[PDB]
């Protein structure tokens with residue numbers, strides 16, 4: 027809302043709409059992590075920590091009054107700035123349909139990459155642990171297209187043993203998917219051996235993983251969703267920024283399996 | 288509520304009421320800090336941290352996406368246990384009006400002392416800073432009863448210069464108050480030079496301080512107010528506990544002055 | 549109103565309110581002159597001069613048509629500028645309760661001192677004459693606490709002789725008041741010998757004076773009361789200013805007496 031000083035920027039309503047639409051379009055396809063995780067609704071710009079429901083005991087064993095500190099996860103706040111050209115933006119009022127927004131597009135891609143890196147690999151200073159860090163959930167087979175089907179069947183067996191149900195999803199690297207596709211018609215067979223679930227191809231990881239989408243196993247906590255605001259003006263250009271505040275945690279590590287090729 | 292397993296203790300409703308009343312009576316007089324600070328209403332047993340409204344920047348200066356962590360105060364949780372005797376408690380049903388509760392009284396005093404120590408001197412591991420730590424708000428005069436009135440007048444002058452108003456309160460040590468009282472009739476003169484405010488005598492500190500009670504300068508944040516619950520049973524006795532979770536902060540250090548005798 | 553360009557500053561409504569409240573609190577206690585003088589309501593930003601009701605004759609005595617110029621008091625306009633930091637102000641939106649406003653506080657104190665200097669000592673270029681300049685209203689006694697009561701009684705006698713009535717007020721220096729307070733219990737006796745009036749202690753003067761508060765003897769004429777506005781922005785900070793326009797005059801010099809210790 028008001029903390030994004032959007033009413034003090036020398037832009038009209040149509041120019042603001044153009045910027046918003048381009049950013050939204052790129053985010054919707056480049057945020058790969060949000061395709062299979064839960065999103066806990068925005069809490070506000072003031073939210074600072076998320077409880078973990080635990081106490082760390084700081085007193086000795088011989089005291090009468092024993093005390094400790096409660097534990098939580100601190101939220102991460104990011105900010106990335108870029109510049110736009112005022113004359114080029116003003117051509118939009120004359121009626122140009124294709125204005126130049128290359129700086130905005132480049133910054134949006136970098137922000138999305140940062141967030142996906144946090145989800146998949148974690149941040150040691152914040153204390154989050156990523157999906158690929160769970161090395162006790164890893165199974166191994168070969169690189170032949172038949173080995174992929176064997177691995178999927180074994181993964182579903184392990185899920186049933188642990189009691190996990192629901193739709194299943196395969197998240198795989200694009201280069202590996204193309205190599206598998208060349209050898210044979212993997213699709214329509216992968217889905218059948220995965221009981222009608224989706225396939226998601228990403229460049230973020232270099233192998234595959236299988237997840238259950240019943241709900242409540244991977245949480246992305248948001249304080250303020252991605253927003254665009256105003257900073258200052260530099261003699262012919264406008265400086266704007268993209269901001270967000272979030273954190274991530276894995277509740278049930280039993281709904282995830284890592285395939286190693 | 289239910290996390291205090293009070294329905295599983297071998298006690299009747301009258302015995303629970305007797306225990307509650309004795310504890311409440313002692314707390315009301317032994318909690319000295321709560322006589323002049325604000326109390327922010329209970330937030331619940333799940334509250335874990337209180338925001339500070341700040342960001343600590345963890346990235347280098349040459350990055351494109353710059354990030355940081357938001358800052359907060361973690362809550363302190365305490366627990367103190369004691370034992371009561373079942374036969375002695377059962378005499379209450381036969382009609383004894385004065386049952387023995389010495390263990391309960393001793394534990395209650397220790398808990399109150401712990402909380403007041405945190406308020407007046409702070410805890411370095413939690414990150415709270417106490418009232419007596421502000422050494423830039425200290426003024427000095429002598430030990431004569433006239434010097435007390437001079438110090439109070441100067442303190443009110445400093446408050447006016449900073450813009451602080453409202454009722455004023457003098458918090459002083461009991462031994463020093465008695466020594467002042469011996470020499471002359473300090474009261475009715477202290478109040479006049481303090482514009483009709485209160486005097487509070489405590490054994491917690493060894494000098495005096497003057498505070499303004501307009502509101503919103505010293506906050507005590509509570510998650511769960513002081514409560515009594517049940518733990519187990521030991522062959523003839525019942526083990527019970529006292530619990531609480533809280534934190535403290537000083538918003539405006541300009542509403543406080545420390546007198547050094 | 550609109551001449552204070554407050555709608556062009558990169559601040560939100562909450563930040564404007566915070567600045568206004570701090571300035572108002574400091575002014576209310578640091579404007580000592582306004583505690584015992586009349587205030588003639590604001591006339592507007594365009595008011596320029598206040599009539600004196602007199603004509604100065606500029607022609608010679610042998611002319612047929614004789615003319616002159618009417619006399620008035622020109623208003624004094626002041627402006628003081630300060631700078632605030634934008635990032636520190638933006639922490640208020642994250643939820644910080646104690647933001648840093650040291651520049652604002654320092655400037656407010658200097659403005660109040662300027663106005664009180666004009667009231668008590670006058671400005672020779674504007675043509676105002678201050679309270680302490682009336683040397684024919686001065687009486688003299690000693691520095692003993694008994695001499696203060698004798699002086700107050702004599703002052704009230706002089707007021708009655710001139711016909712002045714109404715509540716009476718004693719305005720005295722803080723250091724002298726403290727020295728008097730040490731020797732004996734001056735208060736409750738000063739009020740009795742002053743027929744139930746107030747005592748005001750200020751650091752502006754170095755002696756005492758006694759005034760009558762019946763009304764209409766000392767006037768402070770305002771065109772525009774103290775206000776805060778916006779000037780410009782310097783790369784990370786905001787430049788703001790405090791402005792006012794006023795003048796002062798003493799109608800009846802017989803309602804004032806100067807005590808010299």
Ligand SMILES: Cc1cc2nc3c(=O)[nH]c(=O)nc-3n(C[C@H](O)[C@H](O)[C@H](O)CO)c2cc1C
Nearest residue numbers: 111112113114115116117118119120261262263
């Ligand atoms: C015909 C004409 C149209 C212009 N239109 C714009 C405009 O829409 N926005 C702008 O920033 N500068 C514009 N400029 C440039 C502007 O006068 C000046 O160079 C400013 O410093 C921005 O370059 C225009 C210049 C000319 C000659």
Ligand SMILES: Cc1cc2nc3c(=O)[nH]c(=O)nc-3n(C[C@H](O)[C@H](O)[C@H](O)CO)c2cc1C
Nearest residue numbers: 372373374375376377378379380381522523524
């Ligand atoms: C007449 C009598 C009354 C007793 N009443 C109680 C009682 O109210 N509560 C209790 O815990 N034990 C009571 N006891 C003791 C109980 O029988 C036994 O010693 C238990 O192990 C508790 O001490 C009582 C014993 C006697 C002889």
Ligand SMILES: Cc1cc2nc3c(=O)[nH]c(=O)nc-3n(C[C@H](O)[C@H](O)[C@H](O)CO)c2cc1C
Nearest residue numbers: 103104105342344353354355634635638639784
């Ligand atoms: C996480 C983060 C938050 C920031 N927030 C603000 C802000 O609220 N206001 C501000 O003026 N500058 C802020 N800055 C600094 C801003 O990017 C840049 O330094 C501007 O030139 C102001 O210092 C922030 C920088 C970071 C890394």
